Design an enzyme around this catalytic site. Structure first.
Site, mmCIF file in Angstrom:
data_model
loop_
_atom_site.group_PDB
_atom_site.id
_atom_site.type_symbol
_atom_site.label_atom_id
_atom_site.label_comp_id
_atom_site.label_asym_id
_atom_site.label_seq_id
_atom_site.Cartn_x
_atom_site.Cartn_y
_atom_site.Cartn_z
ATOM 1 N N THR A 74 -11.928 -40.519 27.034
ATOM 2 C CA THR A 74 -13.278 -40.124 27.511
ATOM 3 C C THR A 74 -14.195 -41.294 27.795
ATOM 4 O OG1 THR A 74 -13.568 -37.872 26.655
ATOM 5 C CG2 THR A 74 -15.537 -39.307 26.670
ATOM 6 N N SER A 75 -14.989 -41.168 28.852
ATOM 7 C CA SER A 75 -15.946 -42.204 29.241
ATOM 8 C C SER A 75 -17.247 -41.532 29.642
ATOM 9 C CB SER A 75 -15.435 -42.986 30.450
ATOM 10 O OG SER A 75 -14.230 -43.672 30.178
#
Lengths: 243, 244, 222, 250, 196, 204, 198, 233, 244
Positions: free
Chosen positions: E1-2
């Site tokens: 995730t970013s």
């Protein structure tokens, strides 16, 4: 024996005096209100009376925003009215949390009615001296008006009125519908429905209103809001250019 | 406070009597009469249905005779609903006993337990006592056929023949008059019907106004059998004994 | 297990295989993995079988009671919220992984829930050991605006990918279509591509083959 | 705070009467009439929709309620009490039965559950009895069709037909005359409509009368297909239209 | 995730990738990590999906009841609720949340609640597995008071890099613009951001 | 260690033409030590039969429990419980102990008194129902029973035939399991009558 | 473990129980009676965890005596054993289970037959002609499987035990310091003070 | 009237009174007199101990709450034990947790609040005792008057008990005088004994009949009884 | 019948709750206290009857602060008022803890309101014997409130309760008419001192002590502070002067 009039147990006639006296309290504020359904909106009118000159008129209201979509007008003492309002707001927030969708007007009404029914059966809780009129434009039922009393009773209305002179407003509204033959104000805008509401409030009560004598709440798809002294004024002007 | 509205259901009268128990009994006295007669080869339970109508479904009905165990049954006199509450806990107690000792509960143990529950509403809690009196008719391998009776106070006793409900005084004298230790189930069945027939506050004693049950040890088997008579069966035994 | 969910132009469909297994042994060659939460909300589950079944009935039970209380049709989001909060509460110990679908007054819905309580939304989903074989198919043939028939095919094809390629899956394909305006139709054993060939011999034993020591009648009547 | 009312509000009087139960019954007597007739292949329960204002929408107020798909109820007495009793009855049908055995409870047992709830409000601390009398009609595989009455005391009884409320005495008498053990469901619905007419002062039509039946399975009301054993609910509420049609043959 | 939130001249923007994995498998490639707790108060979720979803759902509930009684809540208040839940239940949660809202008096605001449950108000914040790779880049290209277009560009580039290096990130880039004007949803596909 | 492998034992049920059969071994041991060869694992409540393999103490406890529950059921329902219903009672009763289960493998067999239809079902220790039409297997020699049943079984066998088939399945499976055997009993069930037979088998 | 043996003959049940009480490196007592009389015709022997052993025995004793006085009756051996099994079955799933194994020997005055019940700490009950707990069973079950007959007299039963006890004194690693034998029959419970050389 | 509204403390009379509280106050008046007064350096408590028989002791009326605080009671002894014990804990807590001696003003607030609770809830009863609290804190000498009503007041001096009115008028007169008795404890005490005697009538303060307590600048709250007060009679 | 006034939550036949009304009597019997809302804050002031020369001047303070921005003053049973503030203080601490932002005046008003209304719902508690005037400055302005024993409350321009509530209200009304533009914090403090001096005539028998406190966005930074020294004397004089 003579205590069958102090707590909620039956009287030899099968009556519950405390609930009856609780009904009496609902008129203590001498305020009248009514609600009517539009084509796609719901309006509630309520007399606003500010006697003391030391009061901040902006803080004197008996209309409440229970949720983004539900509005509620109370007929009765303000403290019981605020107790009912907070509970209803809580009940609505929790409902959305647990079930994933907005609590419908009729459901919150049933829930509040059930809570009231309990003060009607358990001795340590007193009934609330209030009558709650709930309104909204339900995503399933459309414009809605559901009212509950100290008996734990509730039902939906085509329109309704509550207060000392409730009967005059009711028969007035009844007559208009016997005439129109439909169960709602056939108007596209809510502004006209608000006007209709105020108009009949006047005929029935035989009284004129200034922008500061009324209090108006409107319910539309996805939102319930209250009008300002000025929004009302604009409404009062409009009706004036017809009579 | 609340103290103002408390009836104090568990206090003594100046005479050392328990108000509520006394008043509950008074209530029981207006209930359909129930009779229990113990014979050498079985027990008989007969009760008079209080209030009935042409439209009352008698086939699906039961308001006086309930099965507690396969070897124990009771005849009720009083608030039916109160009775059901006690009957259910009684049924559970019988099963706990069975699950624990892998033996059916001895009649007195079940009766004492139920009576203790009642005694409780008499000494603490501030609740009204149960408006119920039971006639227990059971059988166990230690005392054989037994007949017991318990009331609101929580007191219970054993009998050869006994009645509860309305006109018990009259019924007891009639029973104490024709009962004989060496009786037989069929004799008891008859004594029971006659007694009810003479104490009823109604015109005649018809079958639609009765519930009948017998706990016999069907000779052709060796085990105990409970029989809760069906409408037709009561109508028959009614003609035979000469009440038509 | 292989369960899938495919949304189509006017509804949603869910499918699943019918193999139940304990370790490497097949206990049930034709169980039903498609559960009903409400008449039009159906669920498919993988993971601890007892858990998917128990959680499905519990929420289903409360959904019925809720529907009766509110005088409204159950909503998929409600089954979703109730299921997830329950699973979350139990920190993953209720090994239930489900694909819940259905239609209600607000439209058609397709969601997935994991044992720990997280939920997903999408047009096509698959769960179970057959998850990958199925998703491979779905990723190759899914398109937007599928017809009820195209959806059944796509879903049915996905479950097959599992039956054939996954050892944790096999036997038949159960389907359930939920179309916005009609009743939901459950298609038990919509496909049965694994019928056992006739056995080579009959093993019916000659009576008297088994040595008995004692015999007796059992009392059933009371 | 805290409910300090832990003692009974219903007790025995010197005469042996339980005042609150008597008074509750009096409340029931003042209630709008309701009744039930059992036929050989169905049961019918009906009552009058005594709208409290022509502005009220009588539909949004059902006096006749479904408890399980094969069991319905109607009452006479205090409406609010009935409502919460239906909520509790629907729930106990699940908690104490469906969740254990996986099938809905037979009419007698659910009635027994309801009765228990009412009995408790007659002895528990700090409460008053329920001011209602119910008429529950249902069907179960091993008992067929049945009709029960549950009073404020918690006592219940099975009926072939009966009435409660306002003109119950009159209606009961009228039923005794027209009932027999060979009535078909339609016959009972007719007899029901006739009995109810004597109890209604004003308008008498499909909008002022509420009537429901426990009859054949309605596969059309199931909501889904694909499971042979699931045939649909036996409980069906008649529509305003369905009532009127039967009124012209009154 | 970013995921990341950036305050700018007209308000604030939230961006995120759409990849959620369970091991090396991509359980969902179109995830929507931009969650609404209120009209103009959103958040970016990282860590346990089950935990962050439950957290957000509780917060949304609290802000809904709050609104019923006291009107619209400040973004600072929303961040306080997240914190209360994250801090008080730190032993059983694995949640990293970026809170970003638009107020009329306070314009745009960004608060970050890392693992411990501490709260940090910042000009912009980055988080999630992929964030480690864009610390240098973001520090070098962030400017206060950028224009909507500039900000959308900054987030688009930063995340494209995060997605480029972190296998736990990927899919599409989702954005949410929060200004007095309202709320705007933005999306960007691989074919576009991959070639930046 | 493994509660399900301490005592040993097996149970198997099969359907036939208007009949059902449920069988079990008689062994009860503590690891390698054989202790009792009279420990039957089949019980019945009314016309419904229940076999239970696993930890002996739980086998006994569950029997005493279902007798308890079926007794009250009869008193309230005023009729004997049916196979289908009982299966649900067993399932919910097991799941009620979800996080502290009884280490058993229950099996239900019977004929629905009203529809005459034959019924059998199995459960895992937490209540998951396995409803097969052909056969249910349970115990420490379940792999063997699966192999025997899958091979030997065929539809609508007559009572006298289903007896041979079931007995051969039990017996040969038991003989490849160190913890099963030591005697065995088979139950042939029909709408009206039920026969119980003790088989002769290896005692090692 | 300790030696706990039991054998049901024709008209009685004989219970043999080792006399040693060893803790670690020392044999603290050599005249320990690992038995409690539950009722005039029911005897229970026990072996297991240090404290749980007697605490449990006395607890069960107390309850049976209470039952006896309340009902002025003696529960059958079958009933007493069922009560003990349930107690242990509750125990196994409690915070700290009673780690006790028992043999219940009683004479059923109503059936006029001796009965021997073996129950382990898990609540596993089984009725047997002869039983044993612990390592003893490993050498006494096949012995009895050989030399046992249903019609044996109490005297033949005592000879049988003596045979068991000798096998146990030859092959068992521990010195259990002999056994205490007790007989349960229609006349109650009596102890055979002369087994040290019978 | 009154009879219908004095059944319990939770009932207001038609005029807004709480009779149960008032009856509590009445137990105080029936209690032996006690006096309190302070200068700017000290605070003194003078109390008249009452005895049952001539064979009985003269019941103690002064209780130390902490090295810097103490009080005198008039009314139900047990209730003073309860309240003083509570005050001993509040003092104790302040030191252990904040290493701070409890302000006499805060002690009063805590006492008021504890008393108030027993006047708004069913089942309880008001405390039936009056308290006079003296102490030396970070703001000098202090004197508090505690009434079961929950009302606590800070004064230069005062008295409660039977005929307490005498001593009270006397102090209201002597005010300007004693308030300046700084640096001299013996003088404040004497001024107190003189105030208390203004409420005598029955007898005269003897040795085992008088009880005095003092606290201040360099004086830890200490009680003087018998021989110790001889030099003041 | 009668007796409707002996239990707290009981409705009298005319829909009233007499115990609450009797609570009001306790309030009217108390010292007079007021509140004046200015253009950016609020002022509180109260009458402190001097029972005797023994009361240490300036010590027995009555005005109470809640959090750091709210001021509360009440008339009636003082101990009840403290109780209500203790609650308000918790109520405020709770709010800040969850929402970070110190509690808005309206929000705080309802907290007190709901709590007070709660004490009119059961017979196991007594209603509060105090009317309370409180307020402060928050995110959007100044707010003045007055809460009755019934739990009722509203927003006020000026408010008074206690013995001289009429003189006060009379005076307050004049101010409202003669200052439609809004009084100032400095002005309100003086005006307040006067109104108490005037309203003290209804108790002219006993000597008193004045107490003022205020919360002004410009004068106190929005924090509640007590008026002391010079500013106090300056207001005391402004009154002493206009009292003649």
């Amino acid at each position: 024996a003579g205590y069958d009039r102090h707590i909620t147990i039956f009287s030899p006639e099968g009556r519950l005096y405390q609930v009856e006296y609780a009904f009496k309290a609902t008129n203590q504020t001498n305020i009248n209100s009514l609600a009517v359904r539009g084509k796609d909106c719901t309006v509630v009118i309520s007399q606003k009376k500010v006697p003391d000159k030391l009061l901040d008129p902006t803080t004197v209201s008996y209309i409440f925003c229970i949720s983004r979509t539900i509005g509620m007008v109370v007929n009765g003492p303000i403290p019981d009215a605020r107790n009912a309002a907070l509970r209803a707001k809580a009940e609505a927030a929790e409902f959305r949390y647990k079930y994933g969708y907005d609590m419908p007007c009729d459901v919150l009404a049933k829930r509040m009615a059930n809570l009231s029914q309990i003060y009607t059966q358990r001795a340590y809780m007193r009934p609330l001296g209030v009558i709650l009129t709930f309104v909204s434009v339900d995503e399933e039922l459309g414009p809605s008006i559901y009212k509950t009393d100290p008996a734990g009773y509730y039902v939906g209305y085509k329109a309704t009125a509550t207060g000392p002179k409730q009967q005059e407003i009711t028969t007035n509204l009844e007559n208009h519908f016997k005439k129109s033959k439909i169960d709602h104000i056939n108007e596209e805008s809510w502004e006209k429905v608000v006007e209709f509401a105020i108009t009949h409030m006047i005929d029935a009560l035989g009284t004129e209103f200034s922008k500061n004598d009324l209090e108006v709440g409107v319910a539309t798809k996805d939102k319930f809001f209250t009008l300002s002294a000025e929004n009302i004024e604009e409404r009062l002007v409009a009706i004036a250019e017809q009579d | 406070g609340s103290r103002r509205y408390d009836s104090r259901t568990t206090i003594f009268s100046p005479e050392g009597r328990l108000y509520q128990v006394e008043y509950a009994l008074e209530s029981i006295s207006h209930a359909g009469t129930a009779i229990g007669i113990m014979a050498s080869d079985g027990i008989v339970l007969a009760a008079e249905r209080k209030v009935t109508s042409t439209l009352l479904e008698q086939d699906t009905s039961t308001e006086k005779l309930y099965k507690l165990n396969d070897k124990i049954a009771v005849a009720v006199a009083g608030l039916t609903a109160d009775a059901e509450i006690l009957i259910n806990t009684a049924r559970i107690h019988a099963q706990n006993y069975l699950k624990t000792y892998n033996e059916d509960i001895p009649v007195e143990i079940l009766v004492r337990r139920l009576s203790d529950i009642k005694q409780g509403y008499t000494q603490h809690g501030g609740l009204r006592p149960f408006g119920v009196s039971f006639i227990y008719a059971g059988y166990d391998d230690r005392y054989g056929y037994q007949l017991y009776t318990s009331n609101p106070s929580g007191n219970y006793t054993g009998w050869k023949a006994i009645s509860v409900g309305a006109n018990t005084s009259a019924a007891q004298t009639l029973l104490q008059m024709d009962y004989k230790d060496d009786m037989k189930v069929d004799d008891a069945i008859e004594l029971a019907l006659k007694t009810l027939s003479k104490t009823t506050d109604s015109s005649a004693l018809t079958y639609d106004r009765l519930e009948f049950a017998t706990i016999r040890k069907g000779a052709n088997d060796g085990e105990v059998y409970q029989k809760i008579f069906k409408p037709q069966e009561i109508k028959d035994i009614l003609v035979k004994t000469g009440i038509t | 297990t292989t369960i899938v969910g495919v949304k189509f132009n006017n509804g949603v469909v869910i499918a699943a295989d019918t193999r139940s297994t304990q370790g490497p042994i097949v206990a049930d060659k034709n169980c039903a993995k498609l559960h009903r939460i409400s008449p039009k909300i159906w669920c498919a589950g993988a993971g601890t079988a007892a858990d998917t079944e128990a959680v499905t009935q519990l929420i289903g039970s409360n959904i019925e009671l809720h529907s009766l209380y509110t005088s409204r049709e159950p909503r998929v989001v409600s089954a979703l919220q109730m299921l997830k909060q329950h699973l979350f509460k139990y920190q993953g110990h209720i090994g239930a992984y489900l694909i819940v679908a259905g239609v209600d007054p607000t439209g058609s819905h397709l969601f997935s829930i994991h044992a720990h309580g997280s939920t997903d939304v999408g047009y096509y989903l698959s769960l179970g050991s057959g998850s990958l074989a199925a998703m491979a198919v779905l990723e190759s043939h899914w398109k937007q605006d599928l017809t009820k028939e195209e959806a059944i095919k796509l879903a049915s094809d996905a479950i097959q990918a599992g039956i054939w390629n996954d050892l944790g899956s096999g036997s038949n394909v159960d389907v359930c279509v939920m179309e916005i305006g009609k009743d939901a139709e459950y298609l038990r054993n919509y496909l049965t591509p694994n019928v056992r060939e006739e056995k080579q011999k009959s093993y019916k034993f000659p009576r008297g083959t088994t040595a008995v020591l004692k015999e007796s009648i059992v009392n059933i009547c009371d | 705070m805290t409910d300090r009312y832990s003692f009974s509000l219903t007790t025995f009087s010197p005469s042996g009467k339980l005042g609150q139960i008597d008074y509750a019954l009096t409340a029931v007597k003042q209630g709008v009439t309701s009744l039930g007739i059992k036929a050989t292949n169905g049961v019918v329960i009906a009552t009058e929709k005594k709208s409290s204002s022509p502005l009220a929408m009588s539909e949004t107020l059902s006096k006749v309620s479904l408890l399980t798909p094969d069991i319905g109820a109607v009452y006479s007495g205090m409406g609010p009490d009935y409502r919460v009793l239906v909520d509790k009855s629907r729930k106990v049908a699940h908690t104490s039965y469906k969740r254990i055995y996986g099938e809905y409870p037979p009419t007698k047992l659910l009635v027994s559950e309801v009765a228990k709830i009412m009995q408790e409000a007659t002895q528990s601390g700090g409460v008053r009895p329920f001011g209602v009398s119910l008429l529950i009609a249902g069907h179960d595989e091993f008992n067929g069709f049945s009709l029960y009455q549950v009073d404020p005391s918690g006592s219940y009884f099975p009926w072939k037909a009966t009435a409660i409320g306002k003109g119950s005495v009159a209606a009961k008498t009228f039923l005794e005359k027209r009932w027999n053990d060979e009535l078909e469901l339609e016959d009972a619905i007719h007899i029901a409509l006739l009995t109810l007419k004597e109890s209604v002062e004003g308008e008498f039509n499909g909008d002022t009368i509420e009537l429901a039946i426990i009859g054949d399975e309605n596969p059309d009301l199931l909501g889904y297909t694909g499971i042979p054993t699931d045939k649909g609910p036996r409980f069906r509420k008649l529509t305003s239209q369905e009532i009127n049609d039967r009124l012209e043959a009154l | 995730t970013s995921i990341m939130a950036v305050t700018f001249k007209d308000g604030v923007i939230l961006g995120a990738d759409s990849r959620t994995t369970t091991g090396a498998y991509i359980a969902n490639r179109v995830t929507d990590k931009l969650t609404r707790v209120h009209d103009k108060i959103w958040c970016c979720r990282s860590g346990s999906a089950a935990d962050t979803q439950a957290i957000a759902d509780i917060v949304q509930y609290h802000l809904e009841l709050y609104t019923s009684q006291y009107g619209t809540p400040s973004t600072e208040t929303a961040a306080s609720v997240f914190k209360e839940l994250c801090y008080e239940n730190k032993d059983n949660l694995t949640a990293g949340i970026i809170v970003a809202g638009y107020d009329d008096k306070n314009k745009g605001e960004v608060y970050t609640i890392p693992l411990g449950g501490s709260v940090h108000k910042l000009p912009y914040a980055i988080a999630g597995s992929g964030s480690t790779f864009i610390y240098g880049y973001c520090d070098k290209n962030f400017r206060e008071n950028m224009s909507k277009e500039e900000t959308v560009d900054f987030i688009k580039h930063s995340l494209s890099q995060a997605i480029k290096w972190d296998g736990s990130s990927g899919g599409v880039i989702r954005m949410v613009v929060l200004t007095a004007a309202g709320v705007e949803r933005l999306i960007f596909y691989p074919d576009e951001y991959e070639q930046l | 260690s493994d509660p399900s492998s301490i005592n040993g034992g097996i149970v198997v049920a099969m359907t036939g033409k208007d009949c059902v059969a449920i069988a079990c071994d008689l062994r009860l041991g503590s690891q390698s030590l054989g202790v009792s060869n009279k420990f039957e694992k089949i019980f019945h409540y009314g016309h419904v039969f229940l076999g239970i393999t696993g930890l002996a103490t739980d086998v006994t406890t569950l029997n005493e429990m279902f007798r308890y529950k079926t007794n009250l059921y009869k008193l309230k329902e005023e009729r004997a419980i049916e196979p289908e219903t009982f299966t649900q009672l067993v399932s919910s009763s097991l799941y009620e102990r979800r996080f502290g289960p009884y280490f058993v493998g229950p099996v239900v067999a019977g004929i629905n008194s009203k529809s005459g239809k034959p019924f059998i079902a199995g459960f895992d220790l937490i209540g998951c129902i396995d409803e097969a039409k052909d056969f249910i297997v349970s115990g420490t020699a379940s792999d063997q029973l699966f192999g025997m049943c899958e091979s030997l079984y065929e539809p609508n066998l007559e009572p006298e035939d289903l007896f041979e088939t079931i007995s051969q399945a039990l017996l040969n499976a038991a003989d490849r399991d160190a913890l099963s055997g030591w005697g065995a009993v088979v139950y042939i069930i029909k709408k009206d009558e039920v026969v119980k037979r003790y088989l002769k088998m290896r005692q090692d | 473990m300790d030696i706990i043996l039991g054998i049901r003959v024709q008209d009685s049940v004989i219970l043999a129980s080792s006399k040693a009480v060893t803790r670690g490196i020392s044999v603290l007592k050599d005249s320990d009676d690992k038995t409690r009389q539950l009722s005039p015709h029911t005897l229970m022997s026990f072996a297991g965890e240090a404290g749980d052993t007697v605490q449990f025995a006395e607890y069960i004793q107390a309850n049976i005596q209470l039952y006896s006085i309340r009902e002025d009756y003696e529960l059958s051996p079958q009933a007493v054993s069922s009560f003990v099994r349930q107690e242990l079955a509750k125990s196994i799933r409690s915070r700290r289970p009673y780690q006790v194994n028992v043999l219940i020997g009683g004479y059923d005055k109503k059936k006029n037959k001796p009965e021997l019940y073996q129950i382990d700490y898990l609540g596993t009950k089984v009725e047997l002609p002869y039983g044993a707990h612990g390592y003893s069973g490993f050498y006494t079950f096949s012995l009895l499987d050989h030399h046992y007959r249903p019609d044996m007299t109490t005297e033949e039963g005592l000879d049988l035990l003596k045979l068991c006890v000798q096998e146990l004194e030859k092959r068992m690693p521990m010195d259990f310091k002999g056994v205490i034998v007790k007989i349960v029959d229609k006349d109650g419970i009596r102890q055979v003070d002369d087994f040290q050389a019978q | 009237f009154r009879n219908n509204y004095d059944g319990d403390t939770v009932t207001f009379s038609p005029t807004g009174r709480l009779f149960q509280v008032e009856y509590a106050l009445e137990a105080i008046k029936q209690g032996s007199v006690t006096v309190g007064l302070r200068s700017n350096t000290h605070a003194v408590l003078v109390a008249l101990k009452r005895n049952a028989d001539e064979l009985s002791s003269y019941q103690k009326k002064i209780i130390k709450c902490d090295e810097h605080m103490g009080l005198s009671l008039a009314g139900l002894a047990p209730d003073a034990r309860v309240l003083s014990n509570y005050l001993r804990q509040q003092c104790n807590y302040s030191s252990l947790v904040f290493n701070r001696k409890l302000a006499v003003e805060r002690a009063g607030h805590l006492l008021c609040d504890k008393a108030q609770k027993n006047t708004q809830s069913y089942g309880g009863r008001p405390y039936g005792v009056g308290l006079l609290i003296i102490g030396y804190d970070k703001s000098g000498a202090h004197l508090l008057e505690f009434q079961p009503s929950g009302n606590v007041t800070e004064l230069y001096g005062t008295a409660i008990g039977a005929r307490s009115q005498g001593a009270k008028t006397y102090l209201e007169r002597t005010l300007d005088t004693f308030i300046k008795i700084d640096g001299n404890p013996d003088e404040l005490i004497k001024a107190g004994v003189e105030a208390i005697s203004q409420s005598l009538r029955d007898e005269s303060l003897t040795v085992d009949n008088l009880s005095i307590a003092i606290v201040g600048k360099d004086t830890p709250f200490t009680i003087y009884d018998g021989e110790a007060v001889a030099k003041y009679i | 019948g009668t007796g409707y006034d002996l239990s707290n939550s009981v409705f009298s036949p005319d829909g009233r709750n007499f115990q609450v009304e009797y609570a009001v009597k306790a309030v009217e019997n108390g010292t007079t206290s007021i509140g004046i809302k200015c253009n950016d804050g609020v002022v509180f002031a109260v009458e402190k009857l001097i029972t005797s020369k023994l009361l240490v001047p300036q010590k027995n303070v009555k005005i109470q602060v809640v959090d750091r921005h709210i001021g509360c003053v009440y008339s009636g049973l003082i101990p009840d008022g403290r109780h209500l503030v203790n609650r308000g203080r918790e109520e405020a601490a709770s709010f800040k803890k969850l929402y970070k932002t110190p509690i808005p005046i309206p929000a705080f008003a309802d907290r007190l309101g709901q709590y007070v209304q709660a004490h009119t719902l059961y017979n196991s508690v007594r209603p509060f014997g105090v009317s309370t005037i409180f307020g402060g400055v928050d995110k959007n302005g100044a707010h003045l409130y007055m809460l009755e024993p019934s739990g009722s409350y509203w927003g006020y321009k000026g408010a008074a309760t206690g013995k001289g509530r009429q003189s006060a209200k009379a005076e307050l009304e004049k101010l409202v008419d003669h200052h439609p533009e809004g009084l100032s914090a400095r002005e309100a403090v003086k005006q307040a001192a006067k109104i108490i001096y005037l309203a003290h005539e209804d108790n002219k028998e006993k000597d008193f002590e004045l107490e003022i406190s205020w919360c002004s966005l410009s004068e106190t930074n929005g924090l509640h502070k007590f008026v002391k020294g010079d500013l106090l004397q300056e207001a005391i004089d402004f009154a002493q002067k206009e009292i003649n």
